[PDB]
Design a protein around this ligand. Structure first.
Ligand SMILES: Nc1nc2c(ncn2[C@@H]2O[C@H](COP(=O)(O)O)[C@@H](O)[C@H]2O)c(=O)[nH]1
Length: 264
């Protein structure tokens, strides 16, 4: 048969319908029917056509074909959503031998106490930086104050090829760039269940910051759900943290599922 990854979670009606969650990889055994396919998590599941029809009438993400490949590098990590900074900080602190950060590039002048190749790869001219960016040398870049900063493909590769998970502090836009560079990341979205939930997973921030965080999360999910490797939720940060680690463990290893060429 073939394999697909669910991009959504699936009246009181009982049937042989298989339940699944976002990110589950499914082994499709029989897809001859246009409405229901026979499958098993790696019952029946609604076909792409059926999911789309229902969603359209309700008011589209359904599934994407995937294939298993062997990788010899450690997958970079991109944690997104509320509390991601604490999660990034804690992973780096908890497993010094398994997680690391890459060295970013920048055009700003190096301070006297900074070291080139350690703090940043300090670029001589901004023109050179822009050229490399145009040459697709960066997974992501931006401007702060009046200087450029960027996470280069090579800097990430160096960490990944070394066998350690590179903790990235970049937007969801980087996922496709990393995939194309053959540095398949583990993108984890921490989804707030409500405004109240945000207030529970971070007891420090104000109600106003919480509302802003919830709004960003909503927009992030609306735009990049297809790029997430997994979506985690929890009643507390501790629960979120535990789940983030479980995902990384589950999606690590030599064999990973990546987008396939076959199309539904
Ligand atoms: N997300 C993200 N922000 C960064 C990164 N490197 C620097 N920054 C941002 O740029 C600001 C200025 O950093 P600086 O110029 O002092 O090294 C930081 O406070 C931070 O917000 C990075 O790798 N990822």
């Amino acid at each position: 048969g073939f394999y697909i990854r669910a991009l959504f979670d699936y009246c009181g009606f009982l049937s042989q319908a298989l339940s699944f969650r976002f990110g589950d990889v499914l082994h499709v055994i029989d897809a001859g029917d246009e409405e229901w396919w026979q499958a098993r998590r790696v019952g029946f599941i609604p076909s792409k056509r059926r999911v789309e029809r229902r969603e359209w009438s309700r008011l589209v993400l359904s599934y994407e074909t995937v294939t298993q490949m062997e990788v010899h590098y450690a997958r970079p990590i991109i944690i997104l959503g509320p509390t991601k900074d604490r999660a990034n900080d804690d992973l780096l602190s908890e497993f010094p031998d398994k997680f690391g950060s890459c060295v970013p590039h920048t055009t700003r002048p190096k301070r006297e106490y900074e070291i080139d190749g350690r703090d940043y790869h300090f670029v001589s001219s901004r023109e050179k930086m822009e050229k490399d960016i145009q040459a697709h040398k960066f997974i992501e870049a931006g401007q702060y104050n009046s200087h450029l900063y960027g996470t280069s493909v090579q800097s990430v590769r160096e960490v990944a090829e070394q066998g350690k998970h590179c903790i990235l502090d970049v937007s969801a836009n980087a996922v496709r760039r990393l995939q194309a560079a053959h540095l398949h990341p583990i993108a984890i979205f921490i989804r707030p269940r409500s405004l109240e939930n945000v207030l529970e997973i971070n007891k420090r921030i104000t109600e106003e910051q919480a509302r802003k965080a919830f709004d960003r999360a909503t927009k992030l999910e609306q735009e990049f759900t297809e790029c997430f490797s997994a979506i985690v939720e929890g009643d507390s940060f501790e629960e979120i943290y535990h789940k983030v680690k479980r995902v990384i463990e589950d999606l690590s290893g030599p064999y990973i599922w990546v987008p396939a060429r076959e199309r539904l």
